[PDB]
Symmetry: C4
Subunit: 219 residues, 4 copies
């Protein structure tokens, strides 16, 4: 019976049937946004959802027989397994993010279509050649985040009171959003020289990011 199911699974019909449910469930999930819609057709769509969730567990089960160990060493399959498993955890208990994380399944449209898969893989492949820069940065961030907390967190605890807060703030200085009027001009009312900490920080981090982009435009 193995080859029987193995010919169903591997079939064009199967794959295209799954893709058909994804685009359907995805449309159905945008509709579950509308409180209007739900007051009318919410029963339809909760059951339709549980239906699709079964079909997807059935499918993921079949795919496991047909591939065995080959399956749990496939990134894309691992993804599908995990994303479906989230949708299995009862509509209750723990947190409610698990109810919301259900929408992550629409990423199956990426997993189950090679043109998407191509593009995604193309992107992700660029990551390993950045890890040296990324690591450099995280150290830099870590250092300055600590310095900031002990330079400004007493008078300015909203922003620098805690290591985490300094991280968040320093990230935001890095996107350059409201960094001057929102943060450094205020800081400078109390610490005239705070500009000596932030202008350099801005240069370094912006420099590094120019390099990282140009790095990727070599490979």
């Amino acid at each position: 019976m193995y080859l029987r199911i193995t010919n169903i699974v591997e079939s064009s019909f199967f794959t295209k049937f799954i893709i058909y449910l994804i685009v359907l469930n995805g449309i159905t999930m945008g509709l579950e946004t509308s409180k209007t819609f739900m007051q009318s057709f919410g029963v339809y769509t909760t059951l339709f959802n549980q239906i699709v969730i079964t079909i997807f567990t059935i499918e993921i089960i079949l795919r496991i027989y047909v591939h065995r160990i080959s399956f749990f060493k496939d990134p894309w399959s691992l993804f599908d397994f995990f994303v479906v498993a989230i949708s299995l955890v009862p509509t209750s208990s723990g947190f409610e993010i698990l109810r919301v994380l259900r929408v992550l399944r629409l990423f199956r449209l990426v997993t189950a279509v090679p043109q998407m898969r191509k593009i995604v893989s193309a992107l992700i492949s660029v990551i390993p050649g950045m890890l040296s820069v990324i690591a450099l940065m995280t150290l830099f961030f870590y250092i300055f985040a600590i310095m900031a907390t002990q330079l400004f967190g007493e008078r300015f605890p909203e922003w620098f009171g805690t290591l985490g807060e300094s991280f968040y703030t320093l990230f935001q200085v890095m996107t350059l959003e409201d960094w001057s009027d929102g943060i450094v001009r205020p800081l400078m009312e109390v610490y005239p020289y705070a500009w000596v900490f932030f202008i350099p920080f801005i240069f370094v981090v912006t420099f590094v990011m120019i390099n990282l982009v140009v790095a990727i435009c070599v490979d």
Copy 2:
């Protein structure tokens, strides 16, 4: 008579005449901005406008005989067709953007001057090699927009109350404008962990956009 008019249409004089009218009518449309000007020469210009509109329908009619089906397979001609058609709908009824859409005819300067066509065509040609990325993103936006509507739209309906609202907001976070002080620092006064949603969103979206630019700098 076909070849008679075909020699008129194809003539350098004909084209340079049309181009001459565009620049004038374009100049005349920036004058129609001034309430001062309109109170003194408003009629001078409205008739000058109706004049140019006929001349352009006459031309488009002529250009059609000379080209027949070849015409409605030319992007640039199709454009001029649709744009002049807009200017034909009576100055009234329906919506009044149609009165405003009239200034789209100054894009005829692009269509009728070859150096412009080059650059426009240069630009547009870059789009197809972006479609797989652009599609990737749209799915991504779609998924996150839904996640935000159901995570922040009850307490924060201005910004996330509706699927489209979340779309607009997520775009603004992507342009990085007032994303922290405007949206996320606020959100975190109620949802301490909103940063776990928006930092990843900013990374992914910024990365993808760096790749797309680098992609273009390969092709």
Copy 3:
């Protein structure tokens, strides 16, 4: 006497002397900023300043005898002429920006030092390959500035009331600065669909700009 002066003008000592005054007069102009300094040594400075202006007119006079027509066909010499002429208009009357425009003579350090000249020239040379795009953009801006003036300038005259105002506003949207919370969200309180005008504008303008950067990386 010609060759006598021609050997003085073309001398290393001459050039280095001029470069000396520039770096000196430039330091002088930053000190002229301090309200303190001026009460104390302001007179010292104004005479030293007029002295320098003489020397510079003498030089430019000499430089012309030694080059004649060749001089008024040199970009860099023309600049030096045009800048020194400005510093010649009495510190009185007309517009007083002329008193301010004087500091433009510190650009002579770019003109008199070759390494600078190289870099400037390197930059300027990139301009001609952008002119088709820069023209394209201006037309785009012109057309949209007009659409905006007649679409929002009645309720929003601060931002769109005039062709120029719309220009300025549209530029600011292009730098993406406070474009959503500062302008478009406001607009949308009255014109729910103003988003259909600004998102496309932002896409088009940012696309074009990515291309121009990549266009340069090609050339």
Copy 4:
């Protein structure tokens, strides 16, 4: 005994022992952020710190015998030297940034690890090819800052009242942060034409900055 120590110094154990202490001391400095932690285990960590500081001076001393003059011509060692010297200045007196500058020793992880050095060196090497541009900009900034101080610093002394103030403000305009709603729309309520100063400044400075990135993408 020279070769005896030279074998200890050059030992993989020695170098890995140092890297081991850096990662601990770094972990320990993030815990020193928490006021809670300090009330409990603060005395633990002050000693642990002074311990490591001794060890690091011992190492730096040992490393000097083994390398002599070669050591004070090595960037990375010089650094290591200077960063520990800061950490030696008593926990008192002068300024107390010296207490804060102690966190710069975590940059020793960049020094002590070759994978990092590589990446850092890759970056720094790009600097020399930028100095002609950087010099140009600084001149440009200097000139404009002076032009701004004497154009807007009387009415707008918060932002342009001083040479330094103008510098900071001009920098902020250059990052394009809050530049229109925050600076130039205000300025223009009093100086209608202030736009004539800042739009060109934005163009020039953003142009140059595009080139600089592109320059690094050809080197």
